[PDB]
Each structure stands twice: as C-alpha cells, then as structure tokens.
Amino acid sequence: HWGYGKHNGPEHWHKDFPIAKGERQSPVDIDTHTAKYDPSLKPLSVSYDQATSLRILNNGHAFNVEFDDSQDKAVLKGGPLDGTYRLIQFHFHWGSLDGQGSEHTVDKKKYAAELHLVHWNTKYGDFGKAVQQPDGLAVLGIFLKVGSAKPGLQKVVDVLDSIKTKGKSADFTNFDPRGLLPESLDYWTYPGSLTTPPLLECVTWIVLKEPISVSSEQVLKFRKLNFNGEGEPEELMVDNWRPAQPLKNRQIKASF
Ligand SMILES: CC1(C)O[C@@H]2[C@@H](CO[C@@]3(CNS(N)(=O)=O)OC(C)(C)O[C@@H]23)O1
Numbered sequence: 001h002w003g004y005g006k007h008n009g010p011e012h013w014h015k016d017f018p019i020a021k022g023e024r025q026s027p028v029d030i031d032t033h034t035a036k037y038d039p040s041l042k043p044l045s046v047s048y049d050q051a052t053s054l055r056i057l058n059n060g061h062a063f064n065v066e067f068d069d070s071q072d073k074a075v076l077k078g079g080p081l082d083g084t085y086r087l088i089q090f091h092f093h094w095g096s097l098d099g100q101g102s103e104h105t106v107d108k109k110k111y112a113a114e115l116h117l118v119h120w121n122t123k124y125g126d127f128g129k130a131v132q133q134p135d136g137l138a139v140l141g142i143f144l145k146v147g148s149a150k151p152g153l154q155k156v157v158d159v160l161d162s163i164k165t166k167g168k169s170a171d172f173t174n175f176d177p178r179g180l181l182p183e184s185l186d187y188w189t190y191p192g193s194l195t196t197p198p199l200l201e202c203v204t205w206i207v208l209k210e211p212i213s214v215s216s217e218q219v220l221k222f223r224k225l226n227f228n229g230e231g232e233p234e235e236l237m238v239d240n241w242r243p244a245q246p247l248k249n250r251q252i253k254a255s256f
Pocket residue numbers: 059061062063064089091092116118139193194195196197
C-alpha cells in the first residue's frame with residue numbers, strides 16, 4: 001500500500017487515487033511575489049483554550065495526536081473560513097536532513113518540518129461527511145526550522161519512545177496545542193487537498209508565515225520513529241512529505 005519510498009511513494013499514488021493529478025492538490029509552493037493581500041479576509045481566530053487531547057499514535061506514516069472533537073472545544077474560525085471548524089488531530093511531516101521535510105515551500109524554500117493541525121467543518125456533523133465536501137476541512141500549517149527548542153513540543157518529543165513502531169499508541173491527555181504556535185498569525189491561504197491518500201480535495205489551507213523553531217535534539221527524536229511495525233526490519237520514519245504540486249491557476253491570498 002502507499003507510503004513514501006521509491007516503490008510506493010508520491011509518484012505512484014495516482015494509480016490508486018487518480019485525484020493525485022487533480023485540479024486542487026496540495027502541497028504547493030507559495031510564491032510570495034504572486035500571492036496577494038486580501039482585504040476581504042476576516043481576522044483569524046484560533047481558539048484552543050479548552051482543547052481535549054486523547055492519545056498519540058504511530059500510524060505508520062507519521063504520528064497523530066488526536067483530540068475529543070465531540071463538542072466545540074478547540075475551534076478555528078475567521079480568516080477565509082465560514083463557520084466553525086473543530087480540531088480533530090495534529091501531525092507533522094519532516095525530513096532526513098534539516099534542509100528538507102516541509103510539504104509547502106516558500107519561494108521554493110523547504111523547511112525542516114511542517115506541522116498540520118487538522119479541523120473539520122462542524123456544519124457536516126462528523127469528520128467522515130466533511131471529507132465529502134469541498135469546504136469540509138481546514139488545515140493550519142506551521143513551518144518548523146531548527147534553532148532553539150520549542151518548549152510546547154517537548155511533551156510530544158518525550159513520548160515518541162513509547163510509540164516507536166507502526167500501530168503503537170500512548171495516552172496523551174491534557175496536551176495544550178497553544179504551545180505549538182508562533183507569535184504571529186500572518187498567513188497565506190488557498191484551496192487544496194489532503195497531502196496523503198486518499199488526497200481528497202476538501203481543504204482550506206491556512207499556512208502561517210512565521211516558522212516555529214525547534215531544537216536539533218527535538219528533530220532528531222522525530223527521526224528515531226519507525227515506519228515499520230514491531231518485530232519488522234527497521235525503516236526510519238523520515239522524509240514523509242509530499243512534494244509541491246501544480247497550482248493550476250488557483251490564487252494564494254495573503255492575510256497581511
Ligand atoms: C500523519 C498522516 C499522514 O496525516 C494524518 C494521517 C492520514 O492523513 C490525514 C491528513 N493528512 S494531511 N497531511 O493533513 O493532508 O488525514 C487524517 C485526518 C486521516 O489524518 C491525517 O496520517
């Protein structure tokens with residue numbers, strides 16, 4: 001099945017999921033000189049105060065921190081979004097080296113990693129129905145570079161030991177995703193897709209301009225995770241990012 005290697009990676013995905021070559025695929029390169037300030041964009045509202053994390057899971061591609069999305073606790077609204085989007089989970093994409101790892105790029109620049117905070121449009125009742133809608137999801141994207149430690153990330157780092165291999169999960173309650181944010185909420189936005197199979201074209205992407213910095217030791221711990229299950233040959237979980245896809249006449253709008 002699908003992964004990120006030579007034989008099952010981004011270049012093969014289209015065979016099982018023809019939408020891979022679709023009209024609004026993600027990620028994309030953000031050409032900063034072609035992006036335009038949009039005065040019609042409302043203030044962005046990230047409201048994570050009452051967020052209820054549940055567990056962390058190595059799903060064989062990355063690790064997911066999942067949240068209780070059974071009420072309006074952690075929600076995204078404003079910016080390009082109409083209505084209320086509920087936080088369901090977050091995950092990262094990272095590289096084998098610091099000069100690669102992000103999915104979106106900024107004037108072709110690749111960051112060390114990218115954090116995706118995944119939200120679903122509450123007018124659709126559940127996540128599963130949302131992903132049948134052109135405006136079903138909103139993903140907040142945050143670039144990571146290597147510098148000083150991100151204190152709000154350490155609790156995630158410290159648990160990766162426990163979820164090394166595919167299928168492993170750990171309790172991960174009382175984690176506050178507010179500690180993963182940069183100070184500015186300046187962003188670019190464009191309509192796009194899930195960056196993994198089934199590559200559904202259901203996402204409003206909101207990609208923050210300001211990266212967070214994480215330490216070299218924090219990134220190294222991401223890179224110790226495994227793509228394989230327990231008792232199988234070791235395949236380090238690195239380079240689990242899809243490259244930039246054709247913009248196809250979409251417009252990337254800037255909030256700033
Ligand atoms: C870690 C990874 C790749 O991302 C997780 C899961 C499968 O895909 C996602 C969405 N991926 S993304 N990158 O936000 O478009 O869709 C769901 C919501 C199923 O979980 C996300 O595994």
